Design a protein around this ligand. Sequence first.
Ligand SMILES: Nc1ncnc2c1ncn2[C@@H]1O[C@H](COP(=O)(O)OP(=O)(O)OP(=O)(O)O)[C@@H](O)[C@H]1O
Ligand SMILES: Nc1ncnc2c1ncn2[C@@H]1O[C@H](COP(=O)(O)OP(=O)(O)OP(=O)(O)O)[C@@H](O)[C@H]1O
Ligand SMILES: Nc1ncnc2c1ncn2[C@@H]1O[C@H](COP(=O)(O)OP(=O)(O)O)[C@@H](O)[C@H]1O
Ligand SMILES: Nc1ncnc2c1ncn2[C@@H]1O[C@H](COP(=O)(O)OP(=O)(O)O)[C@@H](O)[C@H]1O
Ligand code: VO4
Ligand code: VO4
Ligand code: VO4
Ligand SMILES: [Mg+2]
Ligand SMILES: [Mg+2]
Ligand SMILES: [Mg+2]
Ligand SMILES: [Mg+2]
Lengths: 128, 255, 374, 124, 471, 311
Amino acid sequence: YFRDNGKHALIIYDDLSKQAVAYRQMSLLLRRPPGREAYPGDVFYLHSRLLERAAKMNDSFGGGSLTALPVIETQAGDVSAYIPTNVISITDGQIFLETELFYKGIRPAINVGLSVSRVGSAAQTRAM
Amino acid sequence: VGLKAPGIIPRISVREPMQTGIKAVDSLVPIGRGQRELIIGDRQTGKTSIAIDTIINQKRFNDGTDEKKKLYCIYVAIGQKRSTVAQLVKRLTDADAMKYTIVVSATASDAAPLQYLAPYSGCSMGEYFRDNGKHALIIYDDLSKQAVAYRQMSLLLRRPPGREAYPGDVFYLHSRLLERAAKMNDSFGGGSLTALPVIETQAGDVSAYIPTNVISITDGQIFLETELFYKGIRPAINVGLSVSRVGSAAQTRAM
Amino acid sequence: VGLKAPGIIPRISVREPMQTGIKAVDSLVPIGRGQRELIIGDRQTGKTSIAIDTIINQKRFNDGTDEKKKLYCIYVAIGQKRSTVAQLVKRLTDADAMKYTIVVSATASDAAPLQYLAPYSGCSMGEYFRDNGKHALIIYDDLSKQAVAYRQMSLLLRRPPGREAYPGDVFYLHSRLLERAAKMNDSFGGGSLTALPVIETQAGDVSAYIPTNVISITDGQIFLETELFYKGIRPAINVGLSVSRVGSAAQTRAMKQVAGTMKLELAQYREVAAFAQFGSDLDAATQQLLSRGVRLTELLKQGQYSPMAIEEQVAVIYAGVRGYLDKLEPSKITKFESAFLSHVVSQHQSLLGNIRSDGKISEQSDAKLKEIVT
Amino acid sequence: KDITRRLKSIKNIQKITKSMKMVAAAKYARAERELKPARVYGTGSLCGAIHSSVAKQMKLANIIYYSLKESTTSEQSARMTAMDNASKNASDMIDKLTLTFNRTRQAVITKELIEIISGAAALD
Amino acid sequence: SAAPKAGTATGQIVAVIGAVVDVQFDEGLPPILNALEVQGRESRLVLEVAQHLGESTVRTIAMDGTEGLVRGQKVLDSGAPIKIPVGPETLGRIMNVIGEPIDERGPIKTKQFAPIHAEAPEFIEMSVEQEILVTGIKVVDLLAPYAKGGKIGLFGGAGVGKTVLIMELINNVAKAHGGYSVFAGVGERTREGNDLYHEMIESGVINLKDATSKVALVYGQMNEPPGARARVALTGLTVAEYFRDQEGQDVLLFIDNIFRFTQAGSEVSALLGRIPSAVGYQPTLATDMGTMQERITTTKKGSITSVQAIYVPADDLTDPAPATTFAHLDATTVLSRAIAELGIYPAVDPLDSTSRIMDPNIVGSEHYDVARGVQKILQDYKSLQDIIAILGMDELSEERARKIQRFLSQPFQVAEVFTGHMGKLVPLKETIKGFQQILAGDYDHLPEQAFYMVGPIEEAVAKADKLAEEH
Amino acid sequence: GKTVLIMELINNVAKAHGGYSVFAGVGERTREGNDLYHEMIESGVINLKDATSKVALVYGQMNEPPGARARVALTGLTVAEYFRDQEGQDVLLFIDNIFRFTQAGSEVSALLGRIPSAVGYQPTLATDMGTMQERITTTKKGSITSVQAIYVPADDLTDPAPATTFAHLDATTVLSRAIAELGIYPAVDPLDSTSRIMDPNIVGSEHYDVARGVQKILQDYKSLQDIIAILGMDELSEERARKIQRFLSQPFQVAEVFTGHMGKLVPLKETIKGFQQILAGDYDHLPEQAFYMVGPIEEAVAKADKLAEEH
Ligand SMILES: Nc1ncnc2c1ncn2[C@@H]1O[C@H](COP(=O)(O)OP(=O)(O)OP(=O)(O)O)[C@@H](O)[C@H]1O
Ligand SMILES: Nc1ncnc2c1ncn2[C@@H]1O[C@H](COP(=O)(O)OP(=O)(O)OP(=O)(O)O)[C@@H](O)[C@H]1O
Ligand SMILES: Nc1ncnc2c1ncn2[C@@H]1O[C@H](COP(=O)(O)OP(=O)(O)O)[C@@H](O)[C@H]1O
Ligand SMILES: Nc1ncnc2c1ncn2[C@@H]1O[C@H](COP(=O)(O)OP(=O)(O)O)[C@@H](O)[C@H]1O
Ligand code: VO4
Ligand code: VO4
Ligand code: VO4
Ligand SMILES: [Mg+2]
Ligand SMILES: [Mg+2]
Ligand SMILES: [Mg+2]
Ligand SMILES: [Mg+2]
């Protein structure tokens, strides 16, 4: 509504991962042949289709915006699991949060080398 | 053979232990009567000997005084070569041990259903005692091999497989059974049935599907490690991955 | 193409070896005629070059005297880009090698059945010779890719899959085939067909389903490791995980004289060459069994678009097995193997001639060689 | 593929360590032949961790050679241990990580195999 | 007897899909396991019945190629399973999966033939008598002992020393053997079958002249369909059977890979209308390996001292193939691939090589103790070699093995084609003094690999000279 | 570092290229397609005025169905085709991930009435990747110098996706994830980066030798880094690499948006003298990471000054 009306917005998809756990369910019951870890094959078009909708709007179109941070569940530390690949392979910029650190005091606990801003220095204003 | 295990009220408390005669066993791991003690262990490791000693131990008992201080034996052979079985029947006969024992065989040739229905056939054997005051010791030699042998039967009926073909109710397979060797309260009979399910350890893993399925039930699991044995460390029991569970109730004041 | 392999009685014994021309190959791993030698190896490792040298080696033979001492070639391309194939056809044509070869292609575009039926098409090619006294060399470039390409066809017929989709008869797939390159007894023809099935090594695993399926058949498997190669160690053959199987029957008396120590000197040396890197205080002089891997290794690294005939292969390596070059720090050894020949075909034109006379190492030329080497 | 990687390092550590292991005793041989006459009544009347306990205790060919001669052996003993007490307790891992490959060698083989049939067997 | 009903024992092929031919009879349905004769042929094509699909249609497993078969071809009902001629009149000859002569020497004149599917010997037929039998091999004879009627099992991970060993056991045992012998080659190379043939001629074992032949050769290999590799093992067993029973003698049987009896099902299962299992396999592998191996045994009429071989797919003992098999073999020998690097040959491993005949009563108190002691030192050895010390030995704790490992690496006879090393053997004779020394410490010090590719302690000093170290 | 690299190859190669160019974006972000558009305007490549445009942009991405990602690669190829053939010219083609041509089937296979395979995939992936890639080639009428990109699902080269593909690419570059930690960029690995054009006849005897020698030292290097010495270097056996690893870590142009590092490049020019030194020993000693995020040997001493060590 905002990204199409000049106004901006911040959407948080808390656990797309759990939606992954929750998608296969529905498809298997329609008898749509499973593929990887039951994931209906279009597990991509599942999370491509969505993220691809939070975009930047040009003046000539509105100037509006929508920023999206998809939440994901890391299985012991693996960021490259099917679904994560499926999601990191799309999204531009991924903040990795490691349980491995946290208590160390290292909170947020971000692992550099396995997490990026991607969009580059355009985000960080001259200040940063 | 399709009986449902007794329950909360019929049962009481594992007391009046049963003597294996195996020092390391009893002393360390004491087996109480009316309970299920899992003897897991890889190929060549002693599972059948220990159980065979445990059974040979009732000798002096089956002809002496205290009737209640006795023990009848039911040996179930599942899969095994029918020669290995003749090895035991003859050998147990040497120590006269066969004179108070019942042995049942589902040796390879026998179609899968037999290697399946077999344990549920031995359970019932002993249940005669566990329901008539008398006590008993049943050994299910290789439930593991019965696992190899169950999936067969179900897949052919086209019952969707699940884990490693295992028909899903691979639990109800081995829950249903073990749950039948229980302790009998005076008020119900005082009888008992103790069961030691034999299991095949794959290189050392005790947590494989079926083992979990079985250790997740049984109270007390004696692990036999091929890794040791030759070391002289025989029986070769790994502490930290094997317990008596029932607690010190089994081990008399002596131990 | 659906013929059933001969059998116990038609066959005889792998004798009258076939020359790859690749020193390291033949000497170490000698290929006899009528047999199946598996050349497994990961991406970029030399499988097609070696086979291409092995085939280029029949040159001088296909126009000389002894008809029986010849070899026709059948090169099967399965999967490959049809440009890589044109790379070979043209390249083999450069050495005139194409003039006595037959090449068949099932290059990517071609529907799965073709990439399937292809080998069984080449088998039959050579069977013409193996059934007419004449001999042949067939190369099944990537049976592995044919594995990738077989399951396709079966799954679409709804033939229940088994392992990694592989239609169960993934064995009868590659048993049936290899089993067709056999040795022919005089009483049946004397002909032959030798086959080297190419296989794709996944990071180093030689025991994958299909490889097991193939190594579990073939007699003799030359493993090519990408892990080495660049090291200079090319062909890069791993001993302990690669054999000739057929035994010393392939290697003529010549190699049975020199090579007899080469491959198993390195069978356990894979330990010491895997230790020396940290010795110090051990058996002081155990260093010999070590001095003998390094220096030789640099003689054991054939590499070029050119084959060194049997009597030249009897020239340079022998010199090592009979430790004379020895001691000298390696490095320049490459120039020996290079120059020893330009030096041999310039003055020593008789010593090689004692292998086309006696066909082994002479008491004489032992000395003669021993004089140019020292 | 994967365990191959951490199984490489072990094997890579072997060559250097396991060979030096032999040296561990060799250093001894190249010492006693001359040290002995100078010892007992002949006069009077990684890298383990041996070359350390002596140095932390700070809180002319006579003694300087006699001591070093006996200290020589106390110093190389580190190799002894580095190749025998570092490798006695570092191999198991060869027999362990090799023994789970086949666990997750079999696994994958019996994991993806499920999927292949998970669709194949049920249709019409 | 083989005679059908007063109604057509002929069906017409209704479906062909590789190795599975469905057939449809109208007046006389042929039982499961019956051998069927395909008419319209240019050879002999037998289809073994396997199921009774209903709609009066059976389901067969092809015993040879199904090439050119046509939807309508007549298939004949023999009225009895595949039966091969059994008798002394099969010795010295080579049969195939049906009893057809393949050594080309013409018809196999015999008094009768026996069905390849026979009821396994009952409980009250078995025999507890385990009389020993010596091979004079290191690990193989000493460590994991063998025995009369006992089954041998060689677990190889594809080219690790499974078949070489068998030719060898033929060497010491087969030749010198009194009584008849058999060799069923299931699956494996035709190359070997050939050589094995001619080697058995070179050494008289098979003589084409007199009638002094003791071995019988049944083959069915690689260039054939699975219905064939499925039963060649059976046939070469139906042979050994007839000799033990109806002719009371202690036979020997050599199966070159007996689990090919299962690759078979793994190639026919799913295509039969079954739901897969472990690795894809079959919901029958257990009963399969079972029903079959429970024939190759002794009895109140005769004994069958057999020697099998079992392959390790993808090098995984974790395969329910080598695995399931174990429970049958009266002595184990899992040759390791990580062992062939080490050159240790045979690649028999100091762990997974069991036996149900290794007690002090039959092997020795002295012998079975140092065996426990050899694998003992070996166990903490397997750990130490890496654990604690980290590869490089030396370290500390001087608290033999590397020695003993070279001891049991007897390079013997069948391995001559590699480095001239010959028949390293001899029946126990001088193991005494020798191996015991190593363990207690005695005589143990000779400069490591200085005692590598040989066995007897007597060659420690008879080699020290070869490679000397002093001044 | 798969797509960053491609924009880069556009930088040095595309612009300066004579003849036409194409860019099929299959699967990947729309964000990039946009920027790539406007960047191609900022730099004239695509001019909206005259008719001085050389690239052609075919797209079909992520926010679309698989039938679309299945063929966008085809279309952007059908383009490059027409130019090479009917218009005899040596074209260039840029596919941003060409195996999306297979995610496609992996999303339509089973739902088409097919029995799954490797990972679930398809009993066609071989012929698929095949039939398609066997078009993007040269001929007796023109040439197509192409540049593709192939994704590694679950980081597993063991996927029959990156795998099967290999047999098509005339030069490999398996960028490693365990390499990005090390910062080494591009993440091209000293092992799995082959070529069917690396012989002394075309690359150099000198060049292809030290290449063998660079990966040689590198192989026993991969072992030593852990094996024998156990992580910590020093140990013994002084018997360069860490140097060369920094050499081939050219941070170049398309990576400016991170730390100002710019167009580290230059066509072979001064590789001579430089890299050879490292290996034979010459000039090799400069305090380790002191020569890290740069390439030319000339900047060993032109940085030693930046970070000095003495007294
Ligand atoms: N106390 C003992 N000490 C040393 N060895 C023994 C002892 N008791 C029995 N044995 C021997 O140990 C082995 C005991 O285990 P056994 O092989 O019978 O059973 P298992 O390994 O549990 O199962 P399986 O019969 O399938 O191998 C036998 O081979 C036997 O001869
Ligand atoms: N003796 C040699 N020494 C060094 N390099 C060689 C030698 N012979 C050929 N080469 C080069 O080595 C490579 C040989 O292997 P090639 O790539 O042809 O086959 P392959 O790796 O087995 O299979 P594929 O073609 O799929 O990569 C070629 O890239 C070629 O240019
Ligand atoms: N006794 C032995 N000594 C040395 N090497 C052997 C021995 N037996 C086998 N090998 C090696 O292992 C390879 C495979 O062995 P083989 O016995 O043919 O096994 P199988 O036929 O069962 O696969 C041979 O080619 C040879 O290199
Ligand atoms: N040349 C380079 N130098 C430094 N970092 C790089 C470079 N190329 C890529 N990266 C890092 O890796 C991330 C992923 O790279 P990218 O090229 O966008 O790969 P792809 O688009 O193919 O997934 C970037 O966000 C950046 O942090
Ligand atoms: O970031 V890429 O998922 O497109 O490899
Ligand atoms: O299987 V427990 O119920 O013991 O976790
Ligand atoms: O070589 V064997 O595949 O028959 O184990
Ligand atoms: Mg048992
Ligand atoms: Mg090739
Ligand atoms: Mg074999
Ligand atoms: Mg990208």
